[PDB]
Design an enzyme around this catalytic site. Structure first.
Site, PDB file in Angstrom:
ATOM      1  N   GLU A   1       0.805  -1.220   0.000  1.00  0.00           N
ATOM      2  CA  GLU A   1       0.000   0.000   0.000  1.00  0.00           C
ATOM      3  C   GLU A   1       0.851   1.290   0.000  1.00  0.00           C
ATOM      4  OE1 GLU A   1      -3.857  -2.023   2.259  1.00  0.00           O
ATOM      5  OE2 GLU A   1      -3.773   0.148   2.152  1.00  0.00           O
TER       6      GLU A   1
ATOM      7  N   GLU B   1     -14.028  27.769  -3.393  1.00  0.00           N
ATOM      8  CA  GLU B   1     -13.792  28.439  -2.118  1.00  0.00           C
ATOM      9  C   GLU B   1     -13.026  27.562  -1.108  1.00  0.00           C
ATOM     10  OE1 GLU B   1     -17.377  30.072  -0.423  1.00  0.00           O
ATOM     11  OE2 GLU B   1     -16.290  30.999   1.251  1.00  0.00           O
TER      12      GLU B   1
HETATM   13  N1  LIG Z   1     -12.164   3.372   5.885  1.00  0.00           N
HETATM   14  C1  LIG Z   1     -12.306   2.393   4.990  1.00  0.00           C
HETATM   15  N2  LIG Z   1     -11.201   1.830   4.395  1.00  0.00           N
HETATM   16  C2  LIG Z   1     -11.339   0.844   3.493  1.00  0.00           C
HETATM   17  C3  LIG Z   1     -12.590   0.369   3.143  1.00  0.00           C
HETATM   18  N3  LIG Z   1     -12.403  -0.612   2.217  1.00  0.00           N
HETATM   19  C4  LIG Z   1     -11.072  -0.758   1.994  1.00  0.00           C
HETATM   20  N4  LIG Z   1     -10.404   0.130   2.795  1.00  0.00           N
HETATM   21  C5  LIG Z   1      -8.956   0.376   2.875  1.00  0.00           C
HETATM   22  O1  LIG Z   1      -8.498   0.656   1.558  1.00  0.00           O
HETATM   23  C6  LIG Z   1      -7.304  -0.057   1.301  1.00  0.00           C
HETATM   24  C7  LIG Z   1      -7.609  -1.182   0.319  1.00  0.00           C
HETATM   25  O2  LIG Z   1      -8.032  -0.640  -0.904  1.00  0.00           O
HETATM   26  P1  LIG Z   1      -9.448  -0.936  -1.586  1.00  0.00           P
HETATM   27  O3  LIG Z   1     -10.271   0.322  -1.728  1.00  0.00           O
HETATM   28  O4  LIG Z   1     -10.217  -2.020  -0.880  1.00  0.00           O
HETATM   29  O5  LIG Z   1      -8.938  -1.490  -3.018  1.00  0.00           O
HETATM   30  P2  LIG Z   1      -9.609  -1.130  -4.435  1.00  0.00           P
HETATM   31  O6  LIG Z   1      -9.755   0.346  -4.684  1.00  0.00           O
HETATM   32  O7  LIG Z   1     -10.976  -1.776  -4.517  1.00  0.00           O
HETATM   33  O8  LIG Z   1      -8.597  -1.751  -5.532  1.00  0.00           O
HETATM   34  P3  LIG Z   1      -8.490  -3.334  -5.866  1.00  0.00           P
HETATM   35  O9  LIG Z   1      -7.101  -3.754  -5.458  1.00  0.00           O
HETATM   36  O10 LIG Z   1      -8.582  -3.539  -7.353  1.00  0.00           O
HETATM   37  O11 LIG Z   1      -9.623  -4.089  -5.145  1.00  0.00           O
HETATM   38  C8  LIG Z   1      -6.846  -0.612   2.634  1.00  0.00           C
HETATM   39  O12 LIG Z   1      -6.013   0.338   3.262  1.00  0.00           O
HETATM   40  C9  LIG Z   1      -8.155  -0.817   3.367  1.00  0.00           C
HETATM   41  O13 LIG Z   1      -8.011  -0.841   4.764  1.00  0.00           O
HETATM   42  C10 LIG Z   1     -13.716   0.939   3.739  1.00  0.00           C
HETATM   43  O14 LIG Z   1     -14.859   0.576   3.472  1.00  0.00           O
HETATM   44  N5  LIG Z   1     -13.563   1.948   4.652  1.00  0.00           N
END
Ligand SMILES: Nc1nc2c(ncn2[C@@H]2O[C@H](COP(=O)(O)OP(=O)(O)OP(=O)(O)O)[C@@H](O)[C@H]2O)c(=O)[nH]1
Ligand SMILES: Nc1ncnc2c1ncn2[C@@H]1O[C@H](COP(=O)(O)OP(=O)(O)CP(=O)(O)O)[C@@H](O)[C@H]1O
Ligand SMILES: Nc1nc2c(ncn2[C@@H]2O[C@H](COP(=O)(O)OP(=O)(O)O)[C@@H](O)[C@H]2O)c(=O)[nH]1
Ligand SMILES: [Ca+2]
Ligand SMILES: [Ca+2]
Ligand SMILES: [Ca+2]
Ligand SMILES: [Cl-]
Ligand SMILES: [Mg+2]
Ligand SMILES: [Mg+2]
Ligand SMILES: [Mg+2]
Ligand SMILES: [Mg+2]
EC number: 3.6.5.-
Lengths: 436, 422, 303, 54
Positions: A183, A254
């Site tokens: 990440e 803004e």
């Molecule tokens: N706050 C919050 N964080 C999330 C959520 N879903 C995933 N994350 C965070 O987002 C990151 C993972 O990325 P995702 O958004 O799930 O991945 P994606 O955009 O679907 O991309 P892919 O790899 O193709 O599935 C991690 O740091 C997770 O903890 C959510 O519903 N709420």
């Protein structure tokens, strides 16, 4: 009345998006079937809430939103969920196979395949607008879609809507709930490519949200549902000024004017209070909730503003608040706290009050409160978050760990270093404006 | 979405057959292919491993391969035998005489296109093929030689899909023939190049566990296989049930494989004890005496680690226990891959257990297993012992030399990263 | 068990602290850059506070306060005192520091020596010395002298501030006598007179005591300097916690008024006290946060 | 502590309080980027198939 289009990308963007629209609906008295009794001009009008909802001749109130994800699991939930009648099928876009937590895969390989469809759907919303303001873009830094597809989209949005404002809500990766080791790579890469295209980005560190949920809602192991309901409150506070009659942050341009003096330094720290367990209360006062805006434990990103400089600071109250009580709260705080502004900016606060108290999801984890506040402050302390991220990046990248996955998708190794160097310069920028 | 499973040779079909018995149960699918479970979690991601026929029958997306009909006659007779698509049994008559060259170049070459025909037909019914999983041994002829031939051919026809194997490594403690090191070394060479993830199942380790831990005087292939199918259930739990971590084969690979060649995984299972708190699971799963590869993780460093807890238990207690082992033994995790230990929980436990944990490690200690097979290989190869069985099938000595060299290289690669510091 | 890292191999004091943690058998020293630590003994400069307190499941503690340099830099200290209302432009116990003063003082014969560092009576003489950032502060001129010897000296006090911002004054101080022990080394003492003896001298020669004539003022000064920066550096509700050991330097004039010279953020210690102090550090600063399994305090708690 | 720009609506109000005075790529270039990455993937896939053919 100028419209705002919301765009939700990736699991996190979609799921947060879900919670936000649920809240918006509750806040405006829009039922899940889409009808809005309190709304008297059937099939149109230019009220404030219309910046987020269009209307059909049948009186259905329809979010000006698009949901995009490279795999259908999360969006299928929207399609079948409580608020399925709200959304037109053309607003939900899914691929077959996701980015596998790989920026290069989301950006180059799969992005290329689906970008034109997404832009077509957005155009369809734009054409329906009398005076589009721009976009609000919700995504994670860590996901392959949230990082990689989002940056491609942002570049293309600059091309097709060059005169438009673009705001981000960004989920910064936290190991506590992290689903991937790479990440930090995706984070630096997406930040590098998106920097010149975003006017104002609000970072939410999952670590911060996680801890607030444990400490203040007495939740032992917070889920994304807990996290997202809190996050949605913060977003709602930030976007309230666009959806309600007011005079502060009333259009997107803004947000930049009030919070972003230097284009590259466009990441405001958000602080929110009060967060109160619904499973229990003594209502906090104006002084108190305002004082709580300077406690690191209430921030969207854990950092120490005492060891940085402020460039700008907005206070956004919802509920029972009058200017008198705010000014008095400030005075007391000025003399008990460390608040140093950059000496080339005025030491002040732009303040917005909305008499309607925060709304909460029935049977949620948050208690109803009579007054709440969200502080947006552009402080150099937030660079701490860049430094942590850049450090993790350096550890893996020094051994090229996982790099083959990105080269494998057609990205050149050189993009890693361009991206890292741009972040090095970004840390440098914060250093100058903030350090004596 | 869909995974395509292949099982090859005696060992491959024997663990393969147990694997389907186990997971079919967890998903509430009886031997007739009919569902009879009491939950939706069972049927929510059932499409990853089962095709759907009319009458709401569920049929494993599984292909059974052998150069000899023996073991596949046994599987068709076994408990769940009737569940497999009869068109998916693909077998020759000649056998492979525990000879890699026969499986890879001669006897196997003749049968391989028939298999690829079934592989293809199964892939064309897939909404979105993830990739393939193969079960086999590396010590014999069919699973080893033909199995790796299959893999290369599959990659040629589906180069952008994930290739995953469960590979049983040979050991003298549990040996069928003297040429196992030859067959295994030849096979590893193929695996290093053509799979994305390989769970190394060491028959040495399975034996030591049945004997020293489970206190079984005379471990049988049946015992060995119970461990394997339990492990196989555990490591695929994330692919079969709702979950955020390593939910599909590619995301698993991206999380677990920092360098393309270093994709050999050391699995572990708990509980295992002779004739149960969250701490108990956690301590056992990380215990060398629980590793299904005969290597001491304390002799190397973890590059990455996935842990899957199953059953109803405290997520809070899970997180705690993990963070302890990790922060308490932090010397054994490489510092240049931050937060390299990922954890998942699934509410559905395996049959007969309140809770269980499965461990999947990418440790540099794994080099011990390759160094072992390399030593055995070299003892014979110096003297060209038993080579005639292979030269007689058209192979040249030089091909043995390359395999040796490449495996020795793999070993040097693991040592490099065991010495790397931030 | 507890874990710590060592990022200042030159620190005399914490070299001994690490020695004791290890000799507890309940502390494992991790490698310099292993982030899974409970306790950081950080580098004297550019300590990366930004990366502390973000390791899940770990309570992290560090042996420096971020911002405490405001007290421990000659020039910073002056600014702080001058512009900080609870210290004030006119503060009793700090020597004027930075022309109008040079005039007043050389307006009458009464004056007029000033010292400067990062001593003379003529302003331009050292004002040119600088250029060829520094502070200029009145050189007491009327020091208190010891007999026999008729000699000047300074007092060093060690103060430990824990994570709760309790302020602990080590009961043992030292007098560096004739002033730095580095310059001097280049009286039955070793140029180091301790409290037992100095109290006696005070009783013998001046019919007073250490507590009454000097220590009271020292406590006041310490309590005043540290209370002033508390809101700026306290880690009370922060995602990581700090403690730190300070050395305060005092000068005593002939009227037995105590003067603050400076504060050091990274002090050494009297060879004979290393044992006692360092053990105290682990007792009050470390074991308070990370308690062990299964007095007579050496510290004066200031409140 | 000057309070300026006080605006009042039925749904609340806003104002500013002061404490102290003040002491990109074209569609073309993007398409090339994506196409170049695509060609690189294709080259790598072609090398693999060539290798497999050997
Ligand atoms: N706050 C919050 N964080 C999330 C959520 N879903 C995933 N994350 C965070 O987002 C990151 C993972 O990325 P995702 O958004 O799930 O991945 P994606 O955009 O679907 O991309 P892919 O790899 O193709 O599935 C991690 O740091 C997770 O903890 C959510 O519903 N709420
Ligand atoms: N204004 C003053 N009046 C009288 N003596 C002074 C003085 N300033 C400094 N000194 C003398 O000089 C000595 C050291 O000065 P100073 O503390 O300011 O620099 P220093 O930082 O070199 C060593 P340290 O940091 O360990 O104290 C003191 O011991 C004291 O005797
Ligand atoms: N664990 C396990 N190992 C087996 C089994 N059957 C054979 N083996 C091992 O597999 C190797 C022999 O290969 P085998 O599968 O029988 O030959 P093949 O049919 O030619 O692929 C030797 O290393 C045996 O120890 C089994 O059922 N379980
Ligand atoms: Ca209307
Ligand atoms: Ca722009
Ligand atoms: Ca034949
Ligand atoms: Cl435009
Ligand atoms: Mg996702
Ligand atoms: Mg056999
Ligand atoms: Mg001194
Ligand atoms: Mg000094």
């Amino acid at each position: 009345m100028r419209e705002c289009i919301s765009i939700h990308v990736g699991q996190a963007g979609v799921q947060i998006g879900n919670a936000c629209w649920e809240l918006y609906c509750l806040e405006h008295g829009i039922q899940p079937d889409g009808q809005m009794p309190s709304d008297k001009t059937i099939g149109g009008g230019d009220d404030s809430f219309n910046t987020f909802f269009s209307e059909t001749g049948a009186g259905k109130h329809v979010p000006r939103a698009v949901f995009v994800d490279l795999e259908p699991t999360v969006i299928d939930e929207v399609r079948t969920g409580t608020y399925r009648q709200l959304f037109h099928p053309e607003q939900l876009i899914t691929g077959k196979e996701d980015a596998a937590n790989n920026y290069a895969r989301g950006h180059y390989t799969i992005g290329k395949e689906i970008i034109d469809l997404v832009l077509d759907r957005i155009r369809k919303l734009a054409d329906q607008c009398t005076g589009l303001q721009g976009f609000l873009v919700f995504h994670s830094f860590g996901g392959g879609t949230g990082s990689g597809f989002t940056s491609l989209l942002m570049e293309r949005l600059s091309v097709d809507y060059g005169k438009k404002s673009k705001l981000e809500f960004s989920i910064y990766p936290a190991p506590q709930v992290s689903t991937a080791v790479v990440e930090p790579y995706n984070s630096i890469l997406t930040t590098h490519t998106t920097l010149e295209h975003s006017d104002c980005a609000f970072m939410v560190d999952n670590e911060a949200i996680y801890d607030i949920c444990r400490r203040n809602l007495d939740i032992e192991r917070p889920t994304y549902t807990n996290l997202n309901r809190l996050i949605s409150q913060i977003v709602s506070s930030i976007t309230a000024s666009l959806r309600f009659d007011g005079a502060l942050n009333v259009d997107l341009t803004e947000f930049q004017t009030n919070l972003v003096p230097y284009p590259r330094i466009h990441f405001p720290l958000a602080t929110y209070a009060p967060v109160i367990s619904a499973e229990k209360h003594e209502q906090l006062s104006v002084a108190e909730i305002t004082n709580a805006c300077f406690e690191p434990a209430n921030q969207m990103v854990k950092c120490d503003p005492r060891h940085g400089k402020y460039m700008a600071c907005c206070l956004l109250y919802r509920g029972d608040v009058v200017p008198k009580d705010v000014n008095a709260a400030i005075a007391t705080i000025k003399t008990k706290r460390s608040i140093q502004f950059v000496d080339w900016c005025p030491t002040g606060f732009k303040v917005g009050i909305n008499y309607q108290p925060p709304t909460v999801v029935p049977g949620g984890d948050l208690a109803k409160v009579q007054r709440a506040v969200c502080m947006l402050s552009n402080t150099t302390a937030i660079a701490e978050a860049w430094a942590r991220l850049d450090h993790k990046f350096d550890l893996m990248y020094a051994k090229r760990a996982f790099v083959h996955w990105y080269v494998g998708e057609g990205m050149e190794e050189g993009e890693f270093s361009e991206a890292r160097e741009d972040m090095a310069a970004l840390e440098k920028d914060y250093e100058e404006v903030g350090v004596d | 979405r869909e995974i395509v499973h292949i099982q090859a040779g005696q060992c491959g079909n024997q663990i393969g057959a147990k694997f389907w018995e186990v997971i079919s149960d967890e998903h509430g699918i009886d031997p007739t292919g009919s569902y009879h479970g009491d939950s939706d979690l069972q049927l929510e991601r059932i499409n990853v491993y089962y095709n759907e026929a009319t009458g709401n029958k569920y049929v494993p997306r599984a292909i059974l391969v052998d150069l000899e009909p023996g073991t596949m006659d046994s599987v068709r007779s076994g408990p769940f035998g009737q569940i497999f698509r009869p068109d998916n049994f693909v077998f020759g008559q000649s056998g492979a005489g525990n000879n890699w060259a026969k499986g890879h170049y001669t006897e196997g070459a003749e049968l391989v296109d028939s298999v690829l025909d079934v592989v293809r037909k199964e892939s064309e019914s897939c909404d979105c093929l993830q990739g393939f999983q193969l079960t086999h041994s590396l010590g014999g002829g069919t699973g080893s030689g033909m199995g790796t031939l299959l893999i290369s051919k599959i990659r040629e026809e589906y180069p952008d899909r994930i290739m995953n194997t469960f590979s049983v490594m040979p050991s003298p403690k549990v040996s069928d023939t003297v040429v196992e090191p030859y067959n295994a070394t030849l096979s590893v060479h193929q695996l290093v190049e053509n799979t994305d993830e390989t769970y190394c199942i060491d028959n040495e380790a399975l034996y030591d566990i049945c004997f020293r831990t489970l206190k079984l005087t005379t471990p049988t292939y049946g015992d060995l296989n119970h461990l394997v199918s339990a492990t196989m259930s555990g490591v695929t739990t994330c692919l079969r049930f709702p979950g955020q971590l390593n939910a599909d084969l590619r995301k698993l690979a991206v999380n677990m494989v920092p360098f393309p060649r270093l994709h050999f995984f050391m699995p572990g299972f708990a509980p295992l004890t002779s004739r149960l708190t969250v701490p108990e699971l956690t301590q056992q799963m990380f215990d060398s005496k629980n590793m299904m590869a005969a290597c001491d993780p304390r002799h190397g460093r973890y590059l990455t680690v996935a842990a899957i807890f199953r059953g109803r238990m405290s997520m809070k207690e899970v997180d705690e226990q993990m963070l302890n082992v990790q922060n308490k033994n932090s010397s054994y995790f490489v510092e240049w891959i931050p937060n390299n230990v990922k954890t998942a929980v699934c509410d559905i436990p395996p049959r007969g257990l309140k809770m269980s944990a499965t461990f999947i490690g990418n440790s540099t200690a794994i080099q011990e297993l390759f160094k072992r097979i390399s030593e055995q290989f070299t003892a014979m190869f110096r003297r060209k012992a038993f080579l005639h069985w292979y030269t007689g099938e058209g192979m040249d000595e030089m091909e043995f030399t390359e395999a040796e060299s490449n495996m020795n290289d793999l070993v040097s690669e693991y040592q490099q990263y065991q010495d790397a510091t931030a | 068990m507890y874990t710590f890292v060592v990022r200042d191999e030159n620190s005399s004091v914490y070299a001994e602290v690490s020695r004791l943690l290890l000799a507890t058998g309940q502390w494992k020293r991790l490698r310099k850059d292993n982030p899974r630590f409970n306790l950081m003994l950080g580098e004297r400069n550019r300590l990366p506070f930004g990366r502390l307190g973000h390791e899940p499941g770990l309570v992290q503690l560090v042996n420096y306060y971020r911002g405490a340099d405001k007290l421990c830099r000659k020039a910073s200290l002056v600014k702080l005192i001058k512009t900080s209302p609870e210290l004030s432009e006119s503060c009793t116990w700090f020597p004027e520091s930075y022309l109008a003063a040079y005039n007043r003082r050389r307006e009458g014969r009464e004056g007029n020596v000033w010292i400067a560092k990062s001593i003379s009576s003529e302003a331009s003489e050292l004002l040119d010395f600088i250029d060829e950032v520094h502070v200029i502060q009145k050189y007491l001129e009327k020091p208190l002298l010891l007999e026999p010897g008729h000699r000047k000296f300074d007092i060093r006090s060690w103060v430990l501030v824990d994570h709760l911002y309790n302020i602990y004054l080590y009961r043992e101080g030292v007098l560096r006598t004739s002033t730095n022990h580095c310059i001097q080394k280049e009286y039955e003492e070793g140029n180091e007179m301790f409290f037992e003896e100095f109290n006696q001298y005070l009783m013998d020669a001046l019919n007073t005591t250490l507590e009454n004539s000097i220590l009271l003022q020292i406590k006041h000064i310490i309590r005043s300097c540290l209370m002033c920066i508390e809101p700026a550096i306290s880690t009370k509700h922060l995602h990581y916690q700090s403690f730190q050991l300070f050395g305060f330097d005092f000068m005593v004039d002939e009227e037995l008024k105590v003067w603050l010279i400076e504060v050091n953020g990274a002090p050494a210690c009297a060879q004979k006290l290393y044992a006692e102090l360092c053990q105290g550090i682990v007792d009050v600063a470390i074991s308070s946060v990370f308690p062990l399994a299964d007095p007579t305090s050496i510290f004066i708690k200031l409140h | 502590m000057e309070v300026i720009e006080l605006n009042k609506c039925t749904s609340g109000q806003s104002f500013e309080v002061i404490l102290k005075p003040p002491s990109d790529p074209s569609l073309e270039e993007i398409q090339k980027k994506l196409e170049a990455a695509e060609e690189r993937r294709k080259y790598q896939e072609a090398e693999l198939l060539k290798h497999l053919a050997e």
